[PDB]
């Protein structure tokens, strides 16, 4: 109960929102015969909604007074999977992309016409450097330690 | 210079209309004027500051006088709620009759504007209670503007 928020699996308003969603979906479902393709699509949508609400309840999310889950980014260990773990994953992927791009730009820096390698990407070198960003934190840390990350102009 | 603006020889001899424009937006930029020194610039700044103080005092005096003369401060003091403040009266010859009907608010006998600047509450809190106090304050602020 952080910041006066009830858990989503013990929230009456969360179940109420699920009830409204299922009622609207059933009202849409009543227009078609049960063996038809639109009826099957609506039933699949209802099952997806039920699974979504059950997963949101079981994930440990804290639901506000309006029945919607509220993310906590203060760093609480109960809610590290809302911001901190996806944030670390995003930082890893973004560092991968940035390191691969920087390595490609460094590799084609000392050429006769480097710009020709930017409008037309040299695919073998790019594919060689693609997996170099898997170990981007180690390479970046060592390059910073050896003073190769920055340029003193 | 021999032509408006007199503070800029370059703008004065302009044969186009932009001179009339450019003598307005460069009037208070003394540092770009013609044949100016440091002490003259500082004295002009001092005089303009005195003028600005005078207009501020005159504007406050006008607010007090119009509230005293056309507002309902005395009836607002007795009932701070359920009474709308009145800033100043409305005299518009272009007004139609329903405009006179809809704009007659408060205890006024004609069209008035409802004050939303909060001067009523500020003057009520700090001790002003009657219209003669507002008249005296307006006179004092006019005297301060003249000073």
């Amino acid at each position: 109960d952080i910041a006066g928020l009830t858990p989503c699996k013990e929230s009456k308003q969360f179940a109420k929102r699920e009830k409204q969603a299922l009622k609207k979906l059933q009202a849409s479902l009543k227009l078609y015969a049960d063996d038809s393709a639109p009826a099957l699509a609506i039933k699949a949508t209802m099952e997806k909604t039920k699974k979504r609400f059950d997963n949101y309840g079981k994930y440990g999310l804290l639901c506000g007074s309006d029945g919607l889950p509220h993310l906590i980014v203060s760093g609480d260990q109960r809610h590290w999977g809302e911001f901190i773990t996806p944030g670390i994953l995003f930082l890893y992927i973004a560092g991968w992309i940035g390191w691969v791009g920087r390595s490609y730009l460094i590799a084609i820096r000392d050429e006769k016409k480097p710009t020709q390698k930017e409008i037309i990407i040299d695919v073998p070198l790019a594919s060689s450097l693609l997996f170099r960003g898997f170990s981007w934190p180690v390479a970046a840390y060592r390059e910073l330690l050896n003073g190769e990350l920055v340029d003193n102009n | 210079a021999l032509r408006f603006p007199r503070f800029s020889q370059g703008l004065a001899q302009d044969p186009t209309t932009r001179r009339i424009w450019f003598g307005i937006a460069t009037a208070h930029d003394f540092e770009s004027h013609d044949d100016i020194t440091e002490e003259r610039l500082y004295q002009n700044i001092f005089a303009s500051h005195f003028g600005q103080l005078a207009i501020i005092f005159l504007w406050t005096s006008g607010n007090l006088f119009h509230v005293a003369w056309q507002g309902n401060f005395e009836s607002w003091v007795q009932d701070p709620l359920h009474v709308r403040p009145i800033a100043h009266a409305i005299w518009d010859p272009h007004f139609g009759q329903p405009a006179v009907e809809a704009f007659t608010r408060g205890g006024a006998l004609g069209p008035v504007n409802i004050a939303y600047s909060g001067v009523y509450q500020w003057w009520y809190t700090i001790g002003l209670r009657t219209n003669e106090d507002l008249y005296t304050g307006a006179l004092f602020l006019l005297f301060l503007s003249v000073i």
């Binding site: - | 359920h82 709308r84 518009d92 007004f95 006179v100 009907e101």
Partner: protein, 95 residues
């Protein structure tokens, strides 16, 4: 000269070169009656002086506008007369 064929520039004649002409001005004499002209000359003489006319126009216009606005009948302008209707309440009870 300027009037010769295929030539339109004269150094001694600038007004024709630069087109300084009276396109519609006519030097015909006055068509109005002499008595009409005399009556309008003596009856419009005080308005000849332009500074005096400007001052007189400003003062007369201001005085007449103020006199008309102040002493207009109450039934002419709707603003001169009051509401002549009972005032209505506000949407929170006069507040």
């Amino acid at each position: 000269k300027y009037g010769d064929k295929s030539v339109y520039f004269d150094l001694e004649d600038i007004a024709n070169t630069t087109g300084q002409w009276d396109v519609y001005g006519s030097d015909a004499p006055s068509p109005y009656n002499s008595l009409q002209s005399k009556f309008f000359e003596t009856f419009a003489a005080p308005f000849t002086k332009r500074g005096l006319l400007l001052k007189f126009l400003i003062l007369g216009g201001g005085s007449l506008l103020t006199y008309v606005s102040a002493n207009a009948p109450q039934d002419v302008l709707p603003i001169t007369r009051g509401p002549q209707q009972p005032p209505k309440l506000g949407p929170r009870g006069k507040i």
